[PDB]
RNA sequence: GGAUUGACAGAUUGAGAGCUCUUUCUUGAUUUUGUGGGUGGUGGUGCAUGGCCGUUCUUAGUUGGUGGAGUGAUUUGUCUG
């Protein structure tokens, strides 16, 4: 239950909740929307400059 | 269509222990809940024990086989100098 799919008609999908440009990962781990911060969960402090 | 785990920051806390709360993120069969059953315990019992030690005892004492005495417990042997 992670309802951030953003699937449209046409059979096109793009990703809600813009995700991490993590060097550790292949850009699959999703960031996390808080106030004054968007937060990575795998590397639990990476890429935190505000929205 | 998720068992569960972990986490920046803020509150919080002596304490960048998220322990617990807000925000959501992270991981994904290992765990988690209950039952039985275990493990651990510088917890009790030293009067339930082992082992070790100390002491009786820095002394010269202890024992039995065959015989003898004695109904016997026991004694002689292990002695008078």
From Swiss-Prot:
Transmembrane segments: none annotated. The chain holds residues 102 to 152 of 152 of the full protein. The modification Phosphoserine is found at residue 21. Component of the small ribosomal subunit (SSU). Mature yeast ribosomes consist of a small (40S) and a large (60S) subunit. The 40S small subunit contains 1 molecule of ribosomal RNA (18S rRNA) and 33 different proteins (encoded by 57 genes). The large 60S subunit contains 3 rRNA molecules (25S, 5.8S and 5S rRNA) and 46 different proteins (encoded by 81 genes). A zinc finger (C4-type) spans 20-43. This is Small ribosomal subunit protein eS31. It comes from Saccharomyces cerevisiae (strain ATCC 204508 / S288c). Component of the ribosome, a large ribonucleoprotein complex responsible for the synthesis of proteins in the cell. The small ribosomal subunit (SSU) binds messenger RNAs (mRNAs) and translates the encoded message by selecting cognate aminoacyl-transfer RNA (tRNA) molecules. The large subunit (LSU) contains the ribosomal catalytic site termed the peptidyl transferase center (PTC), which catalyzes the formation of peptide bonds, thereby polymerizing the amino acids delivered by tRNAs into a polypeptide chain. There is a cross-link at residues 6, 12 (Glycyl lysine isopeptide (Lys-Gly) (interchain with G-Cter in ubiquitin)). It is found in: Cytoplasm.
């Amino acid at each position: 239950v992670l309802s951030y799919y953003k699937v449209d008609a046409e059979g096109k999908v793009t990703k809600l909740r813009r995700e991490c440009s993590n060097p550790t990962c292949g850009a699959g781990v999703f960031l996390a929307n808080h106030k004054d911060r968007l937060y990575c969960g795998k590397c639990h402090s990476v890429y935190k400059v505000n929205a």
